[PDB]
């Protein structure tokens, strides 16, 4: 056996050495998928979290020596029931909502990603983007929040969390009511395997903390401790 | 305008589809059956080749 | 104008009537006299390991020995299936690869995916190091499938409801095929490489000729997205697997449904479809973590291939029919015989 | 101040040779057909006076010689000349009442049977848990590799326990003690008689350090980031196996050099046993630290009101990290006496014996992924 | 670590028995 | 091929009542989830109501939370939306929409601009 001696040593052994070298690099990085509508301001998030770090765009950023690859889908058609299956094993999915007519489509889209077969066990980080616009709109008074959603009329503040900045209860009530809609759609199904982490929108630390929580939860699940 | 042109080209494609005669379905099934019976002896999955010449032991 | 809808409806009704007249009796009354195939047992002769993420596609070489596989970890690995020996491990510019191909000469290898571009790598080059040789760009949606005609031209199908015929040396699009409404999910090239088929995700399949470039025939039998498609060995038929947990068979001249491979217990859709050397076996991949082996004529699910720990993604039978390969989402390639 | 059967045999031989040398070194025959000096196997009573209560001090080689120094025994020499015999027997009269000695056994036997039942059940469960873990290729992660190493350590500990408590029966059998009475061809002097107990100590240390490895790996999975698998696994194997010999081998060396009596079975001085006991306590303490950290993490995760889930989590984590050893850890055997010693021994031996079984049925049988694997294997076999 | 203490205790117990038995055997019968 | 065809709706005064029934052909109706979408002038597609697999779980938007009734009849192979207390802002083009996959409780691209399994639409004007 000499004809396939070097043909094995030079090829298979070196290739396996390279594969072992890059397997740890692959496992040491977290892959995130960025989602959001065309008016969600997700590109602003990309620039904001990239400055200090055609069919698809990659944004590699690292926070305290942990590597994150965030993939933002661009130059793609709206029909996305097919390529969404590619992100089967991403560590998390970032959802960005322009909470400022428009909210029904975003709610339905988040509901659709919540209940998909291939995204059943992948958690979602929710970003209720454009908080300043929401505050200005609700303080303005011309735009009524209760006519797009009559449930807001009989709504009260969840009082489980408090608004740290000084602001009147109206903006807090609206900002928590939208989050309540999203969280109710989230908790209607999908119990145990995956969760949703809502944040009012730095974002790099938020993504890092939520990914840490996701990994810890998965590891504890593997040990039947949760 | 654009919608009318799109509908016209769709109708033209449909008409071009409506221009080739289709052979009887029984003939198109018998031909496939005959082809399958023709290459039956050369199909390793149909007739399991023995380990003497099988490259995947 | 506003009267074209009724005229198109009448034309499609005429098509339906012409198809109905071409049907004499149920197919089950013709093939009921054939000998049932029986029962198929396959066992994993060898499992190729080394991929990290899920394997999305793979292609057999023209020789029954070499075989390329594409994984979403960003890797294109070439195996010698005889001895489980890896030959090349090409890193990819974009990790989201959805398709891969093997050149008939074995010199080149193609890949593509969510980056909307097709990458052509040269294998037999100076110093024996694999380097990218061409980057075909121009597709709008994600590139769903690619198949080599020769070292000179390659046919691609993308998610922007289009297919194209390329030109590796020039890099431009020789011709483009349009007409699909949903994303094209898979294409299959005829043995003569004079025609091919595209199973788009609009419950419709189309037949194109590469020399002129318009849809010769359109078949509409399925009720959900078509995920896989492959030519019959004689080139006069093709099988489409769809998301309604059904496979179906089409004959170009008949222009009708011929076989409908389905079962009540089957729930998940079809991910990959391939035929055998004689066309007597149709192998299909499913989201149920296993493959099934139907008979083209009997249509009664002769065999089952189980042993994959996740969804089966890619299927492929060699040209000599001596083996089959299944690549699953558990990052495993399995060879069956 | 060591006391043992072989030592007592040596002192008896010295006493016998002293007595015979003294008897044959001088002529005592001042009597006239009276009691004649002779060496009984117990002690030698020399020539005395006829019809007198001759008294001879009891020997000095008895284990309780210091307890009863002045325990002189009589011979009661008769006036006619010959010592009076017993009732229907040929035995000169003597008084076995002065230098005489006058249940822990049960307790030890009950402990022995309880822990041998536990070890047998644990061995039986683990020998099939390892087979289940190795057979299925789906569950071949590094966590399952550490599980398999822990199972092997438990199996080795059970085997060493069986071998050592068989060697105890060999070392004090009737034939062995008869040979020691004859002073030749014993089992204590064998090298294997010490190798077995050294192996027992090594196996115990390996079990404890594999519990430590399991705890530290879980902690790194939760707290720390992701490290290289092929390096961390080699380091963990090294820590689990090679580390619990850097104190086992010095213990064997010091035992062989200083107190090579009794096949290294009896901890004659506590300092030499501290050499092997202290690293065990260090491993137990570190494991308890990571146990409390993991429980706190689980509490924080669950709070973001239920208590049955937390109770189930801590009860299923107790055997994996071996935290049942912390309840009685500061009660060292130096200060463990009375019923406290028995309670500590019972609650430690029983729990350690059944810990293998608990870990096996908690991380190989009720494990959800293993149940799914068995179910899909059954489904695959059903199609056939 | 309880196995070591139990084995040691059992060792001294068995040693004392054997010593007792030696004294009894030496008492009579040679 | 799949085919959805909806009954039309004539011009009515505000607060009026109508009915939009869409019949399906080419697929097993009982095995699919069906929604409603409407396209208002100068606006994109907006989902309105939906029906579960068996017809139990239903949902509406805030605008029609208490004005429209959604139902499906499997035997007649149709899906109905009965409209009550209409408003001038409801004038749109209505399409019945289908889940692209069976056996699933959710799906995408129902409101897409080039979705395949959508009906032609009826012009409901107020």
Residue numbers in the entry:
A (entry chain A): 12 to 64, 205 to 251, 264 to 364, 370 to 394
B (entry chain G): 6 to 62
C (entry chain B): 9 to 345
D (entry chain R): 28 to 129, 136 to 337, 344 to 423
E (entry chain P): 1 to 30
F (entry chain N): 3 to 128
In the authors' words:
Retatrutide adopts a single continuous helix that penetrates the core of the receptor transmembrane domain (TMD) via its N-terminal segment (residues 1–13), while its C-terminal segment (residues 14–30) interacts with the N-terminal α-helix of the ECD, the extracellular tip of TM1 and ECL1.
In GLP-1R and GCGR, ECL1 forms a short α-helix structure adjacent to the extracellular tips of TM2 in GLP-1R and TM3 in GCGR. Regarding receptor-specific interactions, the retatrutide–GLP-1R complex displays three salt bridges (D9P−R7.35b, D15P–R299ECL2 and K17P–E1.33b), with the first two also present in the retatrutide–GIPR complex, while the last one is absent in GIPR due to the positively charged R1311.33b. Conversely, equivalent residues in GCGR (I1942.67b and S297ECL2) are unable to form these hydrogen bonds. Of note, E1381.33bR in GLP-1R and R1311.33bE in GIPR modestly increased and decreased the potency of retatrutide, respectively, indicating the receptor-specific adaptability of peptide recognition at this site. Consistently, alanine mutations at E6.53b decreased retatrutide-induced cAMP signaling potency by 3.6-fold for GLP-1R, 1.6-fold for GIPR and 8.3-fold for GCGR, while at E/D7.42b, potency decreased by 71.6-fold for GIPR and 5.8-fold for GCGR.
